[PDB]
Amino acid sequence: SVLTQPPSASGTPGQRVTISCSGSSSNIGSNTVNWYQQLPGTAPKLLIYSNNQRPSGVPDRFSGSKSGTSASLAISGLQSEDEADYYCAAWDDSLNAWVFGGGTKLTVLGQPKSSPSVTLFPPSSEELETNKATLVCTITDFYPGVVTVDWKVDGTPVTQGMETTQPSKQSNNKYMASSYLTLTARAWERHSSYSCQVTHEGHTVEKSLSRAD
Amino acid sequence: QVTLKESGGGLVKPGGSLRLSCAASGFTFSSYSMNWVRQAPGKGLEWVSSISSSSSYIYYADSVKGRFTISRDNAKNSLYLQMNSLRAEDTAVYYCARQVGATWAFDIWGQGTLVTVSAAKTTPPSVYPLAPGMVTLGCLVKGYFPEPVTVTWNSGSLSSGVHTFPAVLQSDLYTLSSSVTVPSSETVTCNVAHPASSTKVDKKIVP
Amino acid sequence: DDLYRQSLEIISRYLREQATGSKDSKPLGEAGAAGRRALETLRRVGDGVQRNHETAFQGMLRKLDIKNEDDVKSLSRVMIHVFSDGVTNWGRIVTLISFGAFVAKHLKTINQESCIEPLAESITDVLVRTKRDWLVKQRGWDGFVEFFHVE
Ligand SMILES: CN1CCCN[C@@H](Cc2ccc(S(C)(=O)=O)cc2)CC(=O)N[C@H]2CCc3ccccc3N(CC(=O)N[C@H](Cc3ccc(Cl)c(Cl)c3)CC1=O)C2=O
């Protein structure tokens, strides 16, 4: 990236937050720096323009700064719904082209922790008809946004076929995730007990199923 | 109401061509510079091309430079981008963005259109149920390509407490799961749709 | 000169419709579509500037006593002072074009509609030759239209 941003900045709630955007004479040195917010799912939406001018609907707690050939964004008054990638952009007179920064994934890490709501799902009869089987583990409402997901079968741990999605933030601010243990129909029939462990900030939640429902 | 709506993106082979198509609404499209911004899933935004109000000033990013052509039709309120000889590395969500003439700020954006450059064929999803063995039901959308799919519970009516998870890529096939936590003891149907296969499945979950 | 051709034709039309008080309906050849929206955004902005700075323009007019074509061509000496200071912006530009338009009106009252041609040529020279890389950077007349567009 030509404009250079930190990959990940953070702060606890209430604090000042600063995301810098290191420019160049021909980009930030000549033209303005424009900031865009990208929440979890959304498209970017203009956050700050002409260095420090906020549009309609961007609060007084977002400030902008241009310091020669660099640019701070200040999120003065942190909130758990500023989990977003912040992108600066400047027109570059040398390139005759727009250039965005790498992106800075802001995060808040002072909220009260919540343990994961784990939920294990036995394979679909319809999928068993296709000689395949997937145990699904929905992992919802954890914070902070990190979980390791393990799988046992009959006491013996899994190494093959298991997958886990990356954590996605919820409307609640707490994140969610999903693990998928994939077995054959032969495998599903030849093993009885299937555990599924989610370890979250030192504390393992676990829900199993025995095929005999 | 001021909206940008991108169409055209989908599955193209490495080498193929694709025309992304943006529609501008509720403003005077004939008086703004337009912009294509692309974003590789997971990675940061990259600017790709700009075009002034009456197509006289055209600008491209180095990567797309040569292979992509930007154009607009101020009669049809439409911006275009002819993506030619696409390589795997062009798999991105291509947003469209309006430009404030007074600040060059990209103020209005669009929702974005996923482009997926691959050899893999368009496999439709296989919607299976996720019921237990106060009750979190769900559905497992298995073995589709490309992204995206949409899942809505009870035809869009049930939307609170629907956790629709990020998809995983086992082999060259996507797998997504959604799930809703519903009161126990009336039906609960899940409405998957894969517009790359013209697929539309409703599927009833019964414990 | 691609920009001078685009500019001169967009400037001339605005000058000549101000001196007329009636718009020219024939199509633009050189500036194409980019001139149509420019003159429709020159008519709007330059009428605002001409009312804001009637006093100023009238004052510069009575000082710079204009009678003949050589008075019109020697306006180049004072007209550059809209940039002799460092600042370049579209406000300075529509003020340049709005004053030339105000002079084209004056030229009509003294029956000098011949001298609107070398006024338009005088204005485009001061503007294109001196501030080209600013103009090209700021998307030319495409930018002119975009910058002053209001909605
Ligand atoms: C020796 N200097 C001094 C040159 C260096 N300093 C200038 C810098 C400056 C230039 C233009 C603008 S503007 C209104 O275009 O944003 C702002 C600031 C100071 C200045 O001109 N202030 C103006 C303020 C009032 C005014 C308003 C409209 C028109 C003329 C005005 N007049 C009257 C005037 O006679 N302006 C001559 C220059 C000028 C101006 C504007 C035009 Cl359109 C033409 Cl043709 C000429 C003076 C001259 O030649 C002023 O005095």
CB of A65 closer than 8 Å to CB of A54: no
Closest Cα in chain C to B53: C142
- 10 Å Cβ neighbour count for A103? 22
Residues 6+ apart with CB under 8 A from C100: C11, C15, C79, C119, C120, C122, C123
Burial A78-92 (b: 16+ CB within 10 A, else e): bebebbbbbbbbbbb
Residues 6+ apart with CB under 8 A from C25: none
Residue A83: which of A6, A162, A2, A9 has the closest Cα?
A9
- Residue with token string 């030319």: C140
Q: Which two tokens stand for residue A30?
A: 């000549």
Phi-psi region of A204 (alpha: psi -120 to 50; beta: other; left: phi over 0): beta
Rounded CA Rg of chain C: 14
Phi-psi region of B15 (alpha: psi -120 to 50; beta: other; left: phi over 0): left
Phi, psi for residue C133 in degrees, rounded to 5? -70, -20
Alpha carbon of C138: minimum distance to chain B alpha carbons (Å): 10
Q: Which two tokens stand for residue B113?
A: 């259109």
Instruction: Tell me the C-alpha distance between B195 and B175, whole Å.
Output: 15
Alpha carbon of A85: minimum distance to chain B alpha carbons (Å): 8
Q: Greatest CA span in chain C, whole angstroms?
A: 41
Instruction: Tell me the C-alpha distance between A135 and A162, whole Å.
Output: 9
Per DSSP, the residues of chain B read --EEEEE---EE-TT--EEEEEEEESS-GGGSEEEEEEE-TTS-EEEEEEE-TTS-SEEE-TTTBTTEEEEEETTTTEEEEEE-S--GGG-EEEEEEEE-TTT--EEEE---EEEEE-SS--PPPEEEEE----EEEEEEEEEE-SS--EEEEGGGTB-TTEEEPPPEEETTEEEEEEEEEE-----EEEEEEETTTTEEEEEEE--
Question: How far is C-alpha C123 from the geometric centre of its chain's CA atoms?
Answer: 6
Q: Cα of B27 to ligand 1 centre, how many Å? A: 36
CATH of the domain at C80: 1.10.437.10
CATH classification (class only), B1-119: mainly beta
Task: Return the amino acid letter for B191.
Answer: N
Alpha carbon of C110: minimum distance to chain B alpha carbons (Å): 38
B/C interface, count of CB pairs below 8 Å:
49
Task: Return the amino acid letter for B49.
Answer: S
Residues paired with residue A40 on neighbouring β-strands, in sequence order: none
Phi-psi region of C104 (alpha: psi -120 to 50; beta: other; left: phi over 0): alpha
Sheet of A148-150: strand order equals: A148-150, A197-200, A203-206
**Burial class of residue C36, CB neighbours in 10 A (0-12, 13-18, 19+):** middle
Q: Which two tokens stand for residue B74?
A: 């101020």
Q: Are strands B113-117 and B11-12 parallel, antiparallel or unpaired?
A: parallel
Q: Say if C10 is an interface residue toward chain B (CB within 8 Å).
A: no
Residue A163: which of A182, A141, A138 has the closest Cα?
A182
* Cβ within 8 Å, pair B53-C147: no
- Residue with token string 């914070």: A143
Task: Say whether C17 sits in a helix, a strand or coil.
Answer: helix
First-to-last alpha carbon distance for chain B, in angstroms, is 44
* Cβ within 8 Å, pair B103-A50: yes
- When scoring C146, C148, C150, C151 by the number of chain B Cβ atoms within 10 A, the one with the most, hence best to mutate, is C146
Instruction: Tell me the C-alpha distance between B35 and B64, whole Å.
Output: 13
* Cβ within 8 Å, pair C37-B30: yes
Instruction: Tell me the C-alpha distance between B165 and C13, whole Å.
Output: 60
Instruction: Tell me the C-alpha distance between A26 and A11, whole Å.
Output: 32
Instruction: Tell me the C-alpha distance between A163 and A165, whole Å.
Output: 7
Q: Which two tokens stand for residue B121?
A: 């064929």
Question: How far is C-alpha C118 from the geometric centre of its chain's CA atoms?
Answer: 12
Resolution in Å, one decimal place = 2.9
Residue B2: which of B22, B29, B25 has the closest Cα?
B25
* Cβ within 8 Å, pair B57-C146: no
Residue B67: which of B15, B21, B30 has the closest Cα?
B15
Nearest CB to C143; choose among B28, B52, B74: B52
Nearest CA to ligand 1 atom 40: C82
Task: Return the amino acid letter for C60.
Answer: M
CB of A33 closer than 8 Å to CB of A89: yes
Phi-psi region of A15 (alpha: psi -120 to 50; beta: other; left: phi over 0): beta
Cis geometry, peptide bond prior to residue B124 (ω within 30 degrees of 0): no
First-to-last alpha carbon distance for chain A, in angstroms, is 55
Mutate to test the pocket of ligand 1, among C50, C63, C79, C81 (most ligand atoms within 8 A of CB): C81
Per DSSP, the residues of A47-97 read EEBTTTB--TT--TT-EE---SS--EEE--S--TT--SEEEEEEEETTTTE
Nearest CA to ligand 1 atom 34: C60
Element (H, E) at C150: none
DSSP classification of residue A22 = B
Element (H, E) at A120: strand A117-121
* Gaps in chain B after residue (C–N beyond 2.5 Å): 133, 185
Ligand 1 binding site (Cβ under 6 Å of any ligand atom):
C 53, 56, 60, 78-79, 81-82, 84-85, 91-92, 95-96, 99
CB of B205 closer than 8 Å to CB of B190: yes
Give the C-alpha distances (Å, rounded to integers) separating A79 from A35, A64, B195, C101: 18, 18, 37, 54
Q: Which two tokens stand for residue A196?
A: 């599924």
- Residue with token string 């310091």: A67
DSSP classification of residue C139 = T
Residues 6+ apart with CB under 8 A from A203: A115
Nearest CA to ligand 1 atom 35: C60
Three-point CA angle B69, B13, B194, nearest 5°? 100
Cis geometry, peptide bond prior to residue B195 (ω within 30 degrees of 0): no
Q: Are strands B188-194 and B150-153 parallel, antiparallel or unpaired?
A: antiparallel
Give the C-alpha distances (Å, rounded to integers) separating B76 from A119, A150, A155, B72: 50, 54, 64, 8
Count of domains forming chain C: 1
Question: How far is C-alpha B65 from the geometric centre of its chain's CA atoms?
Answer: 23
Q: At what angle do helices C90-109 and C2-20 cross, to 10 degrees?
A: 50
Three-point CA angle B95, B103, A60, nearest 5°? 90
Q: At what angle do helices C140-148 and C2-20 cross, to 10 degrees?
A: 50
Residue C136: which of C19, C25, C3 has the closest Cα?
C3
* Cβ within 8 Å, pair A98-B50: yes
Nearest CA to ligand 1 atom 38: C81
Closest Cα in chain B to A208: B133
Per-domain residue ranges for chain B?
1-119, 120-206
Per DSSP, the residues of C65-112 read ---SHHHHHTTHHHHGGGTTTS---HHHHHHHHHHHHHHHHHHHHTT-
Cis geometry, peptide bond prior to residue B148 (ω within 30 degrees of 0): yes
Structural domain boundaries, residue C124: 1-148
Superfamily of domain B120-206: Immunoglobulins (2.60.40.10)
Task: Say whether C1 sits in a helix, a strand or coil.
Answer: coil
Residue B6: which of A16, A43, A65, A165 has the closest Cα?
A43
The structural domains of chain A, ordered by start, are: 1-111 (2.60.40.10), 112-213 (2.60.40.10)
Give the C-alpha distances (Å, rounded to integers) separating C48 from B38, C52, C53, C105: 40, 6, 9, 15
Give the C-alpha distances (Å, rounded to integers) separating C31 from B74, B112, C38, C104: 16, 34, 9, 21
Instruction: Tell me the C-alpha distance between A76 and A30, whole Å.
Output: 27
- When scoring B2, B47, B201 by the number of chain A Cβ atoms within 10 A, the one with the most, hence best to mutate, is B47
CB of A66 closer than 8 Å to CB of A88: no
Instruction: Tell me the C-alpha distance between C115 and C117, whole Å.
Output: 5
- 10 Å Cβ neighbour count for A42? 12
Instruction: Tell me the C-alpha distance between B35 and B48, whole Å.
Output: 8
* Cβ within 8 Å, pair B101-C146: yes
Instruction: Tell me the C-alpha distance between C23 and C16, whole Å.
Output: 8
Residues 6+ apart with CB under 8 A from B25: B1, B2, B3, B4, B5, B77
Instruction: Tell me the C-alpha distance between A210 and C43, whole Å.
Output: 80
Instruction: Tell me the C-alpha distance between A153 and A155, whole Å.
Output: 5
Task: Say whether A142 sits in a helix, a strand or coil.
Answer: strand
- CB-side exposure of A145: number of CA atoms within 13 Å? 19
Burial A46-69 (b: 16+ CB within 10 A, else e): bbbbbbbebeeebeeebbbbbeeb
Question: How far is C-alpha A71 from the geometric centre of its chain's CA atoms?
Answer: 25
Phi-psi region of B42 (alpha: psi -120 to 50; beta: other; left: phi over 0): left
Query: Which atom of ligand 1 lies nearest, measured to the CA of C57?
Result: 29
Nearest CB to B168; choose among A96, A100, A163: A163
Instruction: Tell me the C-alpha distance between A210 and A153, whole Å.
Output: 10
Task: Say whether C151 sits in a helix, a strand or coil.
Answer: coil
Residues paired with residue A119 on neighbouring β-strands, in sequence order: A138
Question: How far is C-alpha C122 from the geometric centre of its chain's CA atoms?
Answer: 9
Name every chain B residue with its beta carbon within 8 A of the beta carbon of A96: 59
